[PDB]
Amino acid sequence: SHMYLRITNIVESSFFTKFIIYLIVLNGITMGLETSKTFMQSFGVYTTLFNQIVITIFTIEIILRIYVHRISFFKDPWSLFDFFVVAISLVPTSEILRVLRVLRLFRLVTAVPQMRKIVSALISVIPGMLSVIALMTLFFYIFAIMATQLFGERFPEWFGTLGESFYTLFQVMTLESWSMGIVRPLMEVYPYAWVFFIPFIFVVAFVMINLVVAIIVDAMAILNQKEEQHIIDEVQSH
Amino acid sequence: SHMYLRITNIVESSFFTKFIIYLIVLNGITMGLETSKTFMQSFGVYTTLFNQIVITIFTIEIILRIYVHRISFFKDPWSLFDFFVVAISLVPTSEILRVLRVLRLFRLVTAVPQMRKIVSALISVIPGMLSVIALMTLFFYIFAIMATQLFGERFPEWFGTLGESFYTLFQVMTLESWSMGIVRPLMEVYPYAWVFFIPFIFVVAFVMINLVVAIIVDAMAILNQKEEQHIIDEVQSH
Amino acid sequence: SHMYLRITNIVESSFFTKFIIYLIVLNGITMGLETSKTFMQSFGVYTTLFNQIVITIFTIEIILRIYVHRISFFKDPWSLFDFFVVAISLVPTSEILRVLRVLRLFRLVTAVPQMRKIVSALISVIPGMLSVIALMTLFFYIFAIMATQLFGERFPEWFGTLGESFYTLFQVMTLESWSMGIVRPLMEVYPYAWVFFIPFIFVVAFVMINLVVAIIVDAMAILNQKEEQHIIDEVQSH
Amino acid sequence: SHMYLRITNIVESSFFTKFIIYLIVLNGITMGLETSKTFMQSFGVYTTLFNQIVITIFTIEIILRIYVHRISFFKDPWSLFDFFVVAISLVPTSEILRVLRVLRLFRLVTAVPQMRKIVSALISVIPGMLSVIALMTLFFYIFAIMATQLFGERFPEWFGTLGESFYTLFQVMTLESWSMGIVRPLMEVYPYAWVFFIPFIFVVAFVMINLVVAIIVDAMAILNQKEEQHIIDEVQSH
Ligand SMILES: CCCCCCCCCCCCCC(=O)OC[C@H](COP(=O)(O)OCC[N+](C)(C)C)OC(=O)CCCCCCCCCCCCC
Ligand SMILES: CCCCCCCCCCCCCC(=O)OC[C@H](COP(=O)(O)OCC[N+](C)(C)C)OC(=O)CCCCCCCCCCCCC
Numbered sequence: 013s014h015m016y017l018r019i020t021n022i023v024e025s026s027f028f029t030k031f032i033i034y035l036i037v038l039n040g041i042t043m044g045l046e047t048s049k050t051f052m053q054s055f056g057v058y059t060t061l062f063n064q065i066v067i068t069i070f071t072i073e074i075i076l077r078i079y080v081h082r083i084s085f086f087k088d089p090w091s092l093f094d095f096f097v098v099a100i101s102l103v104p105t106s107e108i109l110r111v112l113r114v115l116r117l118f119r120l121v122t123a124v125p126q127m128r129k130i131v132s133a134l135i136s137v138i139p140g141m142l143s144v145i146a147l148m149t150l151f152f153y154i155f156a157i158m159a160t161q162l163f164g165e166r167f168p169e170w171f172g173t174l175g176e177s178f179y180t181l182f183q184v185m186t187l188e189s190w191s192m193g194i195v196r197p198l199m200e201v202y203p204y205a206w207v208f209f210i211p212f213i214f215v216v217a218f219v220m221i222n223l224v225v226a227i228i229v230d231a232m233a234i235l236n237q238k239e240e241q242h243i244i245d246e247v248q249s250h
Numbered sequence: 251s252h253m254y255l256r257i258t259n260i261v262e263s264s265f266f267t268k269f270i271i272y273l274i275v276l277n278g279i280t281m282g283l284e285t286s287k288t289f290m291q292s293f294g295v296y297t298t299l300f301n302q303i304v305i306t307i308f309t310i311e312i313i314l315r316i317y318v319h320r321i322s323f324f325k326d327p328w329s330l331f332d333f334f335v336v337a338i339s340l341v342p343t344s345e346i347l348r349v350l351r352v353l354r355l356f357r358l359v360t361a362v363p364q365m366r367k368i369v370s371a372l373i374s375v376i377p378g379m380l381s382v383i384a385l386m387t388l389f390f391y392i393f394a395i396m397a398t399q400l401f402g403e404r405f406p407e408w409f410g411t412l413g414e415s416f417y418t419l420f421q422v423m424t425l426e427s428w429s430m431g432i433v434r435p436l437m438e439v440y441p442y443a444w445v446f447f448i449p450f451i452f453v454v455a456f457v458m459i460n461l462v463v464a465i466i467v468d469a470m471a472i473l474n475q476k477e478e479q480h481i482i483d484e485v486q487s488h
Numbered sequence: 489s490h491m492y493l494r495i496t497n498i499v500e501s502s503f504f505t506k507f508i509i510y511l512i513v514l515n516g517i518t519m520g521l522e523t524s525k526t527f528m529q530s531f532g533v534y535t536t537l538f539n540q541i542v543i544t545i546f547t548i549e550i551i552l553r554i555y556v557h558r559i560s561f562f563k564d565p566w567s568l569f570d571f572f573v574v575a576i577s578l579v580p581t582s583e584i585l586r587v588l589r590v591l592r593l594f595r596l597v598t599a600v601p602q603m604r605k606i607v608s609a610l611i612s613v614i615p616g617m618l619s620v621i622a623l624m625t626l627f628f629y630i631f632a633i634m635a636t637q638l639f640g641e642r643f644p645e646w647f648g649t650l651g652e653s654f655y656t657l658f659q660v661m662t663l664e665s666w667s668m669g670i671v672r673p674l675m676e677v678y679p680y681a682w683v684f685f686i687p688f689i690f691v692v693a694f695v696m697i698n699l700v701v702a703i704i705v706d707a708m709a710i711l712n713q714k715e716e717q718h719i720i721d722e723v724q725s726h
Numbered sequence: 727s728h729m730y731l732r733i734t735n736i737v738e739s740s741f742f743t744k745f746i747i748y749l750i751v752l753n754g755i756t757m758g759l760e761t762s763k764t765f766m767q768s769f770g771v772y773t774t775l776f777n778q779i780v781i782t783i784f785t786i787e788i789i790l791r792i793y794v795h796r797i798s799f800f801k802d803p804w805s806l807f808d809f810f811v812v813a814i815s816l817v818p819t820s821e822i823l824r825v826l827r828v829l830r831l832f833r834l835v836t837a838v839p840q841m842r843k844i845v846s847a848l849i850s851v852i853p854g855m856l857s858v859i860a861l862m863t864l865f866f867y868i869f870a871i872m873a874t875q876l877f878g879e880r881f882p883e884w885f886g887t888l889g890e891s892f893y894t895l896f897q898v899m900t901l902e903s904w905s906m907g908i909v910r911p912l913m914e915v916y917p918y919a920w921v922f923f924i925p926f927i928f929v930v931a932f933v934m935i936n937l938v939v940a941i942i943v944d945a946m947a948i949l950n951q952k953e954e955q956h957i958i959d960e961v962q963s964h
């Protein structure tokens with residue numbers, strides 16, 4: 013335990029955290045420069061080793077963090093993420109992974125408390141949304157099957173495959189070129205195609221708008237519940 | 251009644267409901283595989299009979315459910331839907347109906363209580379919206395007549411018909427290519443066409459945004475009404 | 489006054505109002521049929537006189553309504569609208585006005601109380617919005633001048649004129665093809681054009697979103713003010 | 727101080743402020759006329775000197791305002807803006823600045839209290855949003871690096887440069903032609919490009935919607951906090 017505590021004061025120190033963040037920022041700046049072919053020609057050698065050095069340091073950090081937090085490390089989503097991102101960066105270049113290495117810049121989120129809280133807040137609406145997500149996904153899936161069967165033969169790029177219909181349906185949901193780009197061309201062969209896509213647009217839009225309304229109103233309901241109980245206690249206690 | 255109760259314990263049992271859901275899911279998976287021409291070549295025979303078997307089972311289920319619920323079955327929207335969807339699936343292939351058969355996967359909504367509640371919640375805003383829907387539809391109808399008269403002769407695809415103008419107006423509402431795709435071309439012949447479509451976009455957008463604002467605020471009003479009465483009773487009772 | 493009251497019981501009767509609405513609906517149906525060249529060939533003669541008859545009746549109605557309400561008629565926006573729309577319909581065909589005649593179908597709004605209330609509610613947010621509308625319009629006006637000067641020479645269709653720049657800026661606000669259709673082409677000649685349109689998109693979007701947030705929140709503030717005073721009175725009276 | 731007060735009664739007078747606003751409006755009208763080549767041919771000489779006269783007056787005003795407010799002038803954002811805009815207008819034409827001169831029409835905002843308040847209100851949400859803006863910007867930056875590396879070689883116009891990828895990513899966020907214009911073309915070479923842009927669209931949309939929800943709900947929380955304390959005091963005092 014003497015050893016354990018020695019490294020624990022380091023890993024827990026303000027300086028340790030600041031250093032890592034410093035590195036994350038430097039490496040973030042570096043990753044953008046590596047975008048310039050000009051810059052690389054001149055200083056690519058400098059940068060590649062700095063990336064190996066940062067990742068070496070980040071690996072020492074994850075290791076030390078694990079000896080400190082023990083099992084609590086892998087029950088922590090933020091630490092898992094730092095693990096998974098640093099580990100990606102450790103797979104040798106010998107291709108998609110080379111690009112995923114830049115995800116280690118999200119470590120600037122996992123290391124900065126203000127950013128953690130933002131992401132925690134945003135994520136917290138999701139668990140209550142899961143069933144609505146399930147229902148929407150079932151909706152897409154049913155309509156994707158139908159679209160593939162109705163239109164996949166004459167419009168294979170957009171509907172010849174369940175995957176392609178899923179993609180197209182998502183495009184229609186975003187309303188991106190849904191009429192000039194998809195439904196009008198479809199209607200030149202299938203004049204009733206509008207009977208398929210208009211209702212689909214109504215549902216997907218109605219559901220999303222009403223999901224937002226429910227989140228706002230149902231939160232106010234809770235807010236009103238919390239303060240209603242506090243007031244009644246003062247009425248009751250006084 | 252002995253007979254009646256025997257089948258009522260079945261139809262009402264946890265196992266009965268789970269089985270049906272199992273089938274709905276299996277059949278849902280099956281319907282997606284039937285999308286692959288490759289898969290069909292190999293196993294289409296297997297799948298077609300499984301669809302006949304599932305639908306046979308689903309028909310036995312609807313029948314049994316009707317002997318159990320009697321008149322209460324047809325006063326239930328969820329049961330009507332299961333009826334109407336299973337009945338569609340019973341029309342012989344000898345074409346649009348073949349595709350509508352996939353609607354029986356929405357039965358995964360009518361059989362799962364969590365999903366029912368979602369749809370019930372979303373639907374519940376609609377009755378209060380009917381008049382606004384009526385007003386919007388009257389608005390579309392008037393403008394569709396006008397557009398057909400103003401532009402249908404020189405732009406028949408987009409406005410030559412009341413139906414076509416309805417479709418185009420819906421496209422403009424979604425803002426999909428309204429300017430580059432419709433109004434700018436229109437303005438090459440009718441330079442004041444913007445006087446028609448800009449105001450139309452303002453109204454349709456203003457109305458929809460303000461419908462959402464009213465739903466949120468008017469709900470809070472009710473929320474505040476409910477808790478205002480509860481507090482006053484504690485002030486009054488205490 | 490004997491005479492005056494005789495016609496006042498008519499104009500105020502349930503039957504009188506229902507009749508007019510009946511006519512508005514019939515005439516509305518008629519206006520849609522007149523869209524079909526086929527229908528007109530066969531029954532155009534029938535319909536044109538029915539339109540003259542309805543408008544004759546509507547003119548008798550406005551007249552009678554004025555003898556009844558006297559000065560109160562022209563201080564009523566709904567009645568003014570019925571006046572202005574029926575008067576349009578009275579200008580002889582000997583062209584844009586022929587199309588504006590269909591506005592008399594909005595009379596179905598001015599005659600149906602449910603519809604009046606909808607429009608009243610929606611309109612009621614506007615007076616508080618006037619200054620924000622003014623600020624947005626000033627914003628457009630300034631940017632339209634700038635765009636005309638920056639881009640009107642090389643892109644006259646989109647920016648050669650203050651009016652054209654106003655139109656284009658509105659298109660960009662709706663986000664319709666703003667990048668592929670306008671800014672990317674602009675950037676082939678003016679590579680910094682993004683410095684103009686991106687900020688413009690940020691402001692217009694930020695302002696509109698925040699106008700909606702303010703309306704919702706400021707209404708809740710009032711709702712909370714009203715119920716806060718009611719509760720305090722019960723605390724104070726009890 | 728005698729001198730100081732003499733000019734202070736002027737600069738602070740209702741008449742002084744009204745005059746400036748009068749000029750701002752006249753000059754605003756003038757700036758729009760200067761857009762017409764026809765108008766300029768006839769009256770350009772008139773207008774150019776009127777612009778020199780207005781700016782001369784506006785310079786006298788800023789000067790006088792500074793002798794009056796002393797150090798308080800440069801600690802005032804509204805006054806800084808009037809300074810910075812009038813100063814721009816003072817750089818001799820001997821080009822982008824000639825266009826920036828029209829920014830002096832925003833002085834109609836800095837001089838009209840109603841407009842000041844609007845802008846103050848809208849701006850006031852921003853300080854609390856800074857971290858979310860930072861997180862979104864980090865998000866863009868990471869994805870821009872990735873896009874440049876994944877697609878910049880085969881699609882240089884859209885992704886060959888970190889700047890170009892930033893621009894394209896912003897376009898995708900606005901959903902402008904994201905599928906037909908960018909991702910579908912990308913997918914003809916990179917069939918998994920959807921794995922990159924769909925999630926990107928989900929995050930950016932989820933974050934913005936949820937930022938709006940949080941602003942509305944967190945404001946209500948405060949509203950409820952303020953009135954909860956007022957009620958409890960009446961319960962407690964009474
Ligand atoms: C309003 C509440 C939330 C609403 C969101 C739910 C709606 C579902 C949206 C689905 C997203 C669109 C899926 C998509 O783009 O492609 C589906 C894939 C692609 O198959 P594939 O054919 O391989 O690729 C497209 C064709 N190709 C190769 C030429 C490009 O093939 C597939 O079938 C894959 C199946 C993916 C669907 C499951 C995704 C749901 C997760 C989203 C929940 C996130 C919560 C925040
Ligand atoms: C903001 C509150 C809600 C706002 C929604 C209300 C606005 C109304 C939107 C109307 C939807 C657009 C209708 C449409 O796309 O086509 C109208 C049909 C088609 O006629 P048709 O000429 O046969 O087909 C188009 C031409 N063609 C054959 C070459 C394709 O011909 C017709 O005239 C049919 C008439 C359909 C209008 C009635 C639909 C209103 C129900 C929507 C309410 C849903 C509540 C959630």
Ligand SMILES: CCCCCCCCCCCCCC(=O)OC[C@H](COP(=O)(O)OCC[N+](C)(C)C)OC(=O)CCCCCCCCCCCCC
Nearest residue numbers: 437441444448621624625628649650651652654655658696
């Ligand atoms: C977020 C809060 C609300 C935001 C809305 C305020 C933003 C202002 C939007 C302006 C609307 C776009 C105006 C427009 O499209 O054209 C402007 C006109 C047209 O001039 P013109 O050159 O004759 O026509 C275009 C060129 N041409 C002939 C080839 C087509 O030439 C003009 O300059 C006319 C000036 C019209 C601007 C005044 C309109 C403001 C009223 C909107 C307030 C409605 C409250 C609900």
Ligand SMILES: CCCCCCCCCCCCCC(=O)OC[C@H](COP(=O)(O)OCC[N+](C)(C)C)OC(=O)CCCCCCCCCCCCC
Nearest residue numbers: 675679682686859862863866887888889890892893896934
């Ligand atoms: C939902 C919460 C708010 C979300 C907003 C935050 C998302 C960030 C949006 C970024 C805006 C898009 C930037 C952009 O359009 O270009 C980036 C510039 C341009 O580089 P450049 O290559 O020179 O020009 C484009 C290529 N060219 C020359 C052929 C046109 O090259 C750069 O890299 C410049 C870096 C600009 C990014 C920093 C801007 C963040 C400030 C926005 C916060 C405003 C608060 C209201």
